[PDB]
Enzyme design. Structure first.
Site: not given
Ligand SMILES: O=c1[nH]c(=O)c2nn[nH]c2[nH]1
Ligand SMILES: O=c1[nH]c(=O)c2nn[nH]c2[nH]1
Ligand SMILES: O=c1[nH]c(=O)c2nn[nH]c2[nH]1
Ligand SMILES: O=c1[nH]c(=O)c2nn[nH]c2[nH]1
Ligand code: NA
Ligand code: NA
Ligand code: NA
Ligand code: NA
Ligand SMILES: [Xe]
Ligand SMILES: [Xe]
Ligand SMILES: [Xe]
Ligand SMILES: [Xe]
Lengths: 295, 295, 295, 295
Positions: A10, A176, A256, A159
């Site tokens: 269930k 970012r 994003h 990044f």
């Molecule tokens: O933190 C990230 N990891 C990733 O693998 C990635 N690929 N694009 N932007 C990203 N940002």
């Protein structure tokens, strides 16, 4: 043909329980959604229309309510273990029970600076979950998790230094937005049975609290080199703080937020250091997973 | 045939804005979903395929971002009024703008007892909303609301003395669970234009806070005779505290939690005074509405 | 303060009904979700905690099931009118009933080219809806609709000649994808009461079928100058085919599919005449509305 | 601590592709949502902040579009295998690619009895899915599925002879409603690589069609002794018709429709043989699973 695997039960059983302290007048509520699936010597229900082996899913539903009436429902690791054990002990031909519990937040309201005795608010859709697998002769395996914890930081995420080839358009960045919905699971060492689970009861709530605290602090404080690097830091700390955990798994979307170039309009500056207005993207999203264990 | 009414525009425009204090290093984020629909002398786009009268919905989207870049986005009543006014002033043939804004929660995180400068959590899906209708020659009409505020009290709710006839099976009760999702809207007196909206800016955040506080306190403290009676008490108090509000509207589901009779199982007692385990009902639900105004 | 408006009732009442032909063995199923809200002399339930004026929402739920047992549930315009009339006739102090019905598709399965007597498939989440307002002394107002009809055409849509100013980035186009979710509502002339609704019963299903057919054919065949121009053509035709309709309202999202420029990758050509792969956009979306009536 | 498992990539990538026949003028559209997760020698991105090993998720997104531009997107088993193979061949340190594809329905419209060249309808939210796991040195594993196929039969379902004990309240029945949402997965024998997948291309669409046809026919025609017994019959037939399938898995909710006793109201008869009006239950639901393989 042959039955290779079968389970049935269930799903989506909503349960609420109230505890009333007669001395203080304080009431505490718990609300869960429960799923129970059974396995065992039930192949003949599929192959020969033999229903005699079937504990009706309706009866499984009844059992969940009865068990909640007669036992504590917290911590959910304990309740799940009681519930699963019931099925393997009661029915000779049932040999495994799989119990999933989702706990919903009902947080006591503060009115005029004082905690209210019987009024509650749903502060977020964050859940605390358990998966309990009770297998006859093999003990109790428990995975505890938090999910639906949604966070954002507006700077201190970077990044750069990723692989660049003929498929790459992404620009490197030193500043970012980072936003995610956290799904974190910690897997306990196998327990021999209900007595052992009972012996560790205080560790369940404490470890959940630790996992949440480590997640939030690390997210807030890490000058993040990537989602990968930040999540690993989280997992490492949880494993260091609770020896009875064997592995920690994180699954994190990268939600994003894109810059919007407004320069076409009267030279308006809204990129890089001048970025103020961004466009949240509903899809697609990065998805990053990792399972961390002991050396 | 003739065009009797027409409006068109862009829906579901997600917007994020960050404010950075260079002195303190503290960052503050705002995230909204915006809808803008226009009306005016646009019938010929429908009847004669005359696109010359159409401000493209894509351009409306651009305008939302540009306006957010150049103006404060808080309080949303102000941002909505700026945005709506823009369209009726810029385009001779557009005579009304309808702006809906949903504000999403990003609450600053507390880490080790201190507010973090740039990290945020989504604490619940509760929203703060505005509907702004800007109509050329008729000023600005603003409806402010909160929605998605989910609460539960485990006692101090009653429901007895209702009409009983041959369609009635419901038993009277002096002690039940009451749970709802609050949708509350306050409608401001008409404003003559943007200057007047600007003059009242401090009242917008204060009235939202008051509406929320009155809702929570009244829900928690009222020994409720019905959803009807409790909601009226809420509305009365809001109108008493802000003279510039003309009406308050509440729309409240009654999210039922049913007793479960377990007496069939070994005489187990789980009803009335012995009720501990309940079954939350997903559907159907009561729905109770009221609009309260001044004498 | 005073109650300016109030309505209350039961929402989300799921109902299924089966009709069994004993002669042929053929069974036909209907499934709906029903909402009923009442108005009348009920202010005192809000202001004085006087529950004597309240027909319990639980009783309204019972009434929906009883009414479905004793009457046809199709066409929904008839069922809604019966249900609404019941409340205003039974209760002296109730003066208006508002009934909303959503009909879910259960389409008879074809097995080996023959219609199956008792097996059904949900072919799409398209709904057929009614809103019935029954107001004592003012008759019965019915709005019928279809919603959730999702369509796409891959060419024969254009959009050029729109207003261009300093807010405009959109390029004119003579060939684009057009996709929408159709929401179409036709409003019937006011009916004097149940006898008159009964007299027009055959027109309800026929007009729904016509509305659907006109929508699909016009969408498929129009070399569309805009969503505005195409929707007007639809509305015009429906009004021409059913004299008892007073207005037709369409509400259409423009669900965008964007070109993807791949030229950065080895000069790959994927725009304009070479466009093959597109990115569907979840948000934002255009939203275009119009209400068409008679000269 | 150590990384025990890791995978990362891009989820929720929406893709549309159009094929245009220049000879006939007929256009055909495909729309999918794609997820690609990679594994390989990437631990250092987590443990040492070494991004040099990361193929950016943004680049994975680009690759999906480029691959769709240069290859057929149908059958999805082929497209998924091409896409997965690309990653393991292009990047020395990537050793596994996991590709999930959900295919959305765009069914060509019939207008006046003729198929329209470029207009399409979404007839239901039923999906066709693939999971493709491409593992360097171990070939290609493909699981194909259909999901979201919602059906109901109004009679010719029974459920009696189940276990009865002190937890049981369910009454035996010889005539009930059976409704479910079908999720069916067939797992192909391992393929050595892309050449072998290409060699079997015609079998993919044919097996999907067979699986769907067997599911519908068996559901409609079986005088069902239980969900368990009916689903086994389905699985047995699919395995008999396609030798390249190794296992078939079904996962079926039992979506309950409850009788409503109306006897309290004027002795109205609505149970057993007199049952006409039922209450669909949103939750809880039975959940029945089975995996069937070869002797
Ligand atoms: O933190 C990230 N990891 C990733 O693998 C990635 N690929 N694009 N932007 C990203 N940002
Ligand atoms: O088909 C069914 N299978 C089951 O296992 C079950 N349990 N309750 N009702 C049921 N129906
Ligand atoms: O059909 C359309 N109507 C519009 O109003 C519009 N605005 N941008 N694209 C558009 N397409
Ligand atoms: O508070 C309530 N108001 C109502 O109108 C009602 N009807 N049933 N239960 C109810 N509870
Ligand atoms: Na056992
Ligand atoms: Na104007
Ligand atoms: Na009346
Ligand atoms: Na490789
Ligand atoms: Xe993170
Ligand atoms: Xe309330
Ligand atoms: Xe359209
Ligand atoms: Xe089934």
């Amino acid at each position: 043909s042959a039955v290779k695997a079968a389970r049935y039960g269930k799903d989506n059983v909503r349960v609420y329980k109230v505890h009333k302290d007669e001395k203080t007048g304080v009431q505490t509520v718990y609300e869960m959604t429960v799923c129970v699936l059974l396995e065992g010597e039930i192949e003949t229900s599929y192959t020969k229309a033999d229903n005699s082996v079937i504990v009706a899913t309706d009866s499984i539903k009844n059992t969940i309510y009865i068990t909640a009436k007669q036992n504590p429902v917290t911590p959910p690791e304990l309740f799940g273990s009681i519930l699963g054990t019931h099925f393997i002990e009661k029915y000779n031909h049932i040999h495994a029970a799989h119990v999933n519990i989702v706990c919903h937040r009902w947080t006591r309201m503060d009115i005029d600076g004082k905690p209210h005795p019987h009024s509650f608010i749903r502060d977020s859709e964050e859940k605390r979950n358990v998966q309990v697998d009770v297998v006859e002769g093999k003990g109790i395996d428990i995975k505890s998790s938090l999910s639906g914890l949604t966070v954002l930081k507006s700077t201190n995420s970077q990044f750069w230094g990723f692989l660049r080839d003929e498929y790459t358009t992404l620009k490197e960045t030193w500043d970012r937005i980072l936003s995610t919905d956290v799904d974190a699971t910690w897997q306990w060492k196998n327990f021999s049975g209900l007595q052992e689970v009972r012996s560790h009861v205080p560790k369940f709530d404490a470890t959940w609290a630790t996992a949440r605290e480590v997640t939030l602090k690390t997210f807030a404080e890490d000058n993040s080199a990537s989602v990968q690097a930040t999540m690993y830091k989280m997992a490492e700390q949880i494993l260091a703080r609770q020896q009875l955990i064997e592995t920690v798994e994180y699954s994190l979307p990268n939600k994003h937020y894109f810059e919007i170039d407004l320069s076409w309009h009267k030279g308006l500056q809204n990129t890089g250091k001048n970025a103020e207005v961004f466009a949240p993207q509903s899809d697609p999203n990065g998805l990053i997973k990792c399972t961390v264990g002991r050396s």
